[PDB]
Amino acid sequence: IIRGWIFGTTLDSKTQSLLIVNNATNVVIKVCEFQFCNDPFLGV
Amino acid sequence: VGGNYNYLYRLFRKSNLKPFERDISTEIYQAGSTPCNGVEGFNCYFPLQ
Amino acid sequence: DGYFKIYSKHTPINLVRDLPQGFSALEPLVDLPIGINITRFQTLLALH
Ligand SMILES: *[C@@H]1O[C@H](CO)[C@@H](O[C@@H]2O[C@H](CO)[C@@H](O)[C@H](O)[C@H]2NC(C)=O)[C@H](O)[C@H]1NC(C)=O
Numbered sequence: 001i002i003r004g005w006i007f008g009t010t011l012d013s014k015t016q017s018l019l020i021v022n023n024a025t026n027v028v029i030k031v032c033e034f035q036f037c038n039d040p041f042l043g044v
Numbered sequence: 045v046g047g048n049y050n051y052l053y054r055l056f057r058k059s060n061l062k063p064f065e066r067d068i069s070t071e072i073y074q075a076g077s078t079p080c081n082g083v084e085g086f087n088c089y090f091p092l093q
Numbered sequence: 094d095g096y097f098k099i100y101s102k103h104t105p106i107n108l109v110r111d112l113p114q115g116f117s118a119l120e121p122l123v124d125l126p127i128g129i130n131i132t133r134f135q136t137l138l139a140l141h
């Protein structure tokens with residue numbers, strides 16, 4: 001039920017933000033200028 | 045001959061960068077008391093040069 | 094110092110009402126070279 005975490009400053013596209021997702025058999029760590037939605041969740 | 049303009053540098057920022065930290069944001073500096081929320085001019089400068 | 098360090102540990106537990114009253118030492122996992130000013134964070138949850 002718990003996949004990963006996001007680490008940022010404003011959690012929008014203005015500044016860069018980290019993001020970790022626990023792939024089923026991998027890891028998807030990426031630090032980009034993500035425009036995070038107000039309710040982040042990983043859907044399957 | 046044209047003095048390539050693709051090489052830029054941050055001339056304005058609101059703090060001092062920490063070691064090995066990268067800043068890529070392009071928000072307009074609010075230099076003076078003017079809000080500077082959107083557009084530029086007077087006391088609103090584009091951070092990069 | 095511009096480095097994001099993650100340590101981790103997995104332990105088998107039985108009483109789940111709270112964290113166990115034991116002693117497990119987390120071991121280093123990653124030392125990623127990421128330069129950002131991390132101030133806030135949020136947890137991801139799977140939504141099937
Ligand atoms: C480190 O990141 C923090 C988080 O944004 C920055 O803190 C801001 O600092 C400015 C300084 O002018 C304050 O006006 C803001 O209120 C602060 N934001 C807060 C408290 O959420 C800080 O500037 C960053 N520093 C570097 C060197 O990147």
Ligand SMILES: *[C@@H]1O[C@H](CO)[C@@H](O)[C@H](O)[C@H]1NC(C)=O
Binds near residue numbers: 037038039040
């Ligand atoms: C809720 O709904 C949409 C559906 O496309 C989802 O992608 C989006 O992240 C959510 N919208 C928000 C949090 O504003």
